[PDB]
From a paper:
Respiratory complex I is a multi-subunit membrane protein complex that reversibly couples NADH oxidation and ubiquinone reduction with proton translocation against transmembrane potential.
Three conformations of the entire complex were reconstructed to average resolutions between 3.3 and 3.7 Å resolving the interface between the arms; however, due to high-residual mobility of the arms, the antiporter-like subunits were resolved at below 8 Å. Although relative arm movements were observed in mammalian and T. thermophilus complex I, their amplitudes were smaller and movement directionality was less diverse. In E. coli complex I, NuoB and NuoD are rotated around an axis passing through the center of NuoH and the interface between NuoF and NuoG by approximately 15 degrees anticlockwise when observed from the top of the peripheral arm. Rotation of the NuoB/NuoD module creates multiple openings in the interface between the arms. Therefore, we think the resolved conformations of complex I represent uncoupled states in which redox reaction is not coupled to proton translocation.
Author numbering:
A (entry chain H): 52 to 321
B (entry chain J): 1 to 164
C (entry chain A): 15 to 38, 60 to 127
D (entry chain K): 1 to 100
E (entry chain B): 43 to 76, 86 to 179, 190 to 220
F (entry chain N): 1 to 191, 199 to 437, 447 to 483
The structure:
Amino acid sequence: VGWGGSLQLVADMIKMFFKEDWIPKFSDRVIFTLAPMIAFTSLLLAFAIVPVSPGWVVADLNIGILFFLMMAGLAVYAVLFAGWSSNNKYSLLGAMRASAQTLSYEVFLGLSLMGVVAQAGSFNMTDIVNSQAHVWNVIPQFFGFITFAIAGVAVCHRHPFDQPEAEQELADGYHIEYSGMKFGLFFVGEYIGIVTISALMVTLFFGGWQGPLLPPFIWFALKTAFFMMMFILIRASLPRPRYDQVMSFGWKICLPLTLINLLVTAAVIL
Amino acid sequence: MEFAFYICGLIAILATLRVITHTNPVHALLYLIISLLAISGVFFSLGAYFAGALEIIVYAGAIMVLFVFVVMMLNLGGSEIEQERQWLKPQVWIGPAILSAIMLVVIVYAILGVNDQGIDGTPISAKAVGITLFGPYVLAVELASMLLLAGLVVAFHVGREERA
Amino acid sequence: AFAIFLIVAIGLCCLMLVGGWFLGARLRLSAKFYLVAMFFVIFDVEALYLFAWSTSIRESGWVGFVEAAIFIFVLLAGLVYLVRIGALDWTP
Amino acid sequence: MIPLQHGLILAAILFVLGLTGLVIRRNLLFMLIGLEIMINASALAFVVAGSYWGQTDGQVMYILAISLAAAEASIGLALLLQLHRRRQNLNIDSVSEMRG
Amino acid sequence: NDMVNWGRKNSIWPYNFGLSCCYVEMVTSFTAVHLRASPRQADLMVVAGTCFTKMAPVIQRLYDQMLEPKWVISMGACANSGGMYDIYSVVQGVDKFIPVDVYIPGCPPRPEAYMQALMLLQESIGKEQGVYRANMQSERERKRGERIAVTNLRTPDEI
Amino acid sequence: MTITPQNLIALLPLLIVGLTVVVVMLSIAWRRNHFLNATLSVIGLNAALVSLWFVGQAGAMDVTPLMRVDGFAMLYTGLVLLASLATCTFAYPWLEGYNDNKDEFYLLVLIAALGGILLANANHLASLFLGIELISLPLFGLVGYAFRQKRSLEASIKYTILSAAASSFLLFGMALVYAQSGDLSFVALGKNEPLLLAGFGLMIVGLGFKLSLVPFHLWTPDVYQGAPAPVSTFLATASKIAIFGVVMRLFLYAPVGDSEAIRVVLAIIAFASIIFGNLMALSQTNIKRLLGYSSISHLGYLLVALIALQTGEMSMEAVGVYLAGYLFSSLGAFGVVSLMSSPYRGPDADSLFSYRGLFWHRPILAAVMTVMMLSLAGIPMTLGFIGKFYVLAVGVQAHLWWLVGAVVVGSAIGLYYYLRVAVSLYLHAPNWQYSAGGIVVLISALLVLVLGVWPQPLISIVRLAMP
Ligand code: SF4
């Protein structure tokens, strides 16, 4: 039997290849093609700002944080042009409610990231990875860390669980009208999304490239693997939350939490 | 630098021409997003590092999303197509096109009169706008927050909800 | 650099898409109530000032924390206003 | 190595194109779209002016200009909401009363 | 290389069309083996339950919607044939109007039968419909000498 | 520079009003009551008038590079505050008959007062922009308040697109000047190449929309017919009063305004504003469109003084007193129009043919409209005549013969429609805060009469304020 966890996803990709493509009638054609890469390329290029090595850095640009927020905001357009390209009021309203809770729960990550970039004081990722040299920026900011966790898992990572189905009748999940390679493109996109959120979390919250007794790149890789397993553990443990309860625990509870979080970090940093 | 600036400026020009020539709205929204991305590329090429990435997060990531919401919810595609193309003929496009072209040639003649004094792509970091925003310019920020409260209340008012 | 990685990514996109091709009116009560998203459109603009703020705070100091507290207090007053009037509530 | 004239004429071209889009079309959505285009053109002109002199004068009012754009687009979109809620016709000639 | 064949054996997407009865055992199986199954995304359709003349067009539209590589598992006597309902209102088997690949007798079959259905279907999927001049061997003929050699069974007065 | 207590005492008008918005917004979210919100908003604006005395204890000084606080700005803040006080007292009787959400009105007027008292204090081109837009957003939204009619929404949408268009012209002009000059500060500007002048012309377009000048006046009829009469009190008086201060300060400080290239263009706009106002104003039979037509001519008389600001120092007090007289005349006239709509009444039916009688219906209120309507024209015993007299003197002082002749012939043409409305209130006939609204317009009637017959005390205040 197959011994590797990734080989199942590999076979899934093989399966999506060589499948006949049908044209949709009474549909727009340019967005039907362009909507997959708005979901894929965003979290693909979210990987372009990680300091995997000082000598093998993929991009030595001055700002990486703002690019990450730009991808966070950009992701919504994939659910919107997918909703309009569904060309069925059912599916369109399903994607409208999915984009609703998406825009609703994407607010928190930037304000949660303000704490770590304020105690770091720079946008160049070399400064952040050199800041976590002895003390990581997770001990004081527990609330900011969990708020960024909720926000990162809330951006189309399936934790809300309103993507392929709809609690509300008169509408339907928006993953139905795509059946060619685009559905595999969606899955591989969320896969690079979860691994890139984990990598950004480890290299921005915890200390990357430390190397206590072993070479630091495999130290980063193993820590990323532990956070991968913990993310999968809590994603599976996380039950489906209906639309209402998600709206209830959104703007009410965590906007004050992040505002007092910014107050606490600004009071303690000086 | 020169070839990149020329090609992204021409991309912006072509996207601006495309958004003002088509009829279907969603194509126009896509081409306007392309134009905004080109403008952010111009901002990064000039050296305004805190502008190209600031435009996308807010100007091309929330407000245009609101435009997409309203054009999606009206469901105006599939209805009222023929008469808009009937009325918007090239002949009535020429009318104000030359009137705006007089303005264009006047501002080109005004701007070509000065010397060049060319500036390189100087990089401006966020460390100094964090001071200049907080130097003389604090009351601008405070009154802008009050401005945003004003926008919130006038949008709540004139977008009043009801039973329907 | 970033340009090389972008060229690689767009070349991979062209390779996958080309390979894929070779392989072979009235809404009534429905929708509406996007005003949570309009609240986001305004609140992202409010938080962009904190986006610019987060880079330089050590040289700002006590008046900076004071008027940042005033700013977020104004935002909090607006938020509780929208909550208490019934604008920010259950939405379809 | 690009001087100011190229960027300023680019901003002027986008300004003119946004004004033309504000003029020629009938749908209020399209006038708001051209309005936002021409606001962005003016903001581009301001940003190139601010970064021309090589100090931090371009990012100081650009944020507030896009704040104005956000508020104006929001009130305009709510006006479109209530206009289409009142009357199904979305032409500007429906609201063309008090002529002369 | 046969890598393409390996891809389809390793991973399959099931579309559960179990009807009024016979689906409680299928659910018993599915909740142990496995919101992922979606219309127009699956390549496997496990038709269970009695196929009726009135609702047969529904099954024909769902059969038409799926992609070019189509697999169908009939489970139960009510889906293989008309089963016990040889009546004016029941069509005598889902195989009358859609091709079927695997037949799982029983009324209702067991979850282990569903497991053996996936095993016989990956076996057919790994030989390329999958005849390949290897499927003439039949479960009636393969385990025949296994079944005939059974002599003693437990008396039915015990648990 | 940093914050000193001198800066806070100087900023006290912008502060009391901002604290009022917060308290009003908290009060709206707490109770959503009309009486409490009206009381809280009027108390804050009255507290801003009281604190004008305290900034008078402070001298002529800067707060930031954005603003300069002089005694000139003290008077302009006062004009804007009484207009805000005037509009809330006229809105309570109109909004008592409104069906729902009757409490957002004072919040928007308070934002507009912040915008008005920010254009009084100006020293940098950016403060000019933070002020224009702070006042427009309530004027974006308050002409669309009570959108249940078919014309309020119409008026709001026409003003919305056009005001955003003017702001985009102002911003593009604001940068094209800063390309030449190293700073956008008014004083630092101009330190006559065509790009600076070309940038200046774009700011004239973006400023002359809100000041209702001759090729931009098309909005002033329509929204004045469409908007509620309480909004028209603020839209006629406060906005243009606040806006005229910043456009005068730019030409006083900037050395580019000294050059004759901009001077000739503004004079022709002023010439045509008087003419293209006072000729199309005759045929109107609607009172709101009639006042909107007169507004174009009044801002034209202000411009014929402003062109001769640079010749003789009497133009400072001339602009100031005509603004004071123009405030009182329009507040009394627009208050009577709003006071006729004592309930909401849906669409108010106001017209020149609808104002037959009105002396045997309500005699006191007809007297106020007549006194103010004669004050708009140039009839003596009214403060408008003294304001008219200084602008004639300023034009004589600077030898602008075509411009002063335009005022006289514009006065000669414009006498006609003011007099019809004055006599049409004498043909044959076809709650507590309402008494308060009557008191405001009656108080203004007494003031314009006593400052027309006896105008010295107002001049003493103006020369006290001018630097
Ligand atoms: S096979 Fe058995 S359980 Fe299934 S539908 Fe037929 S009778 Fe019912």
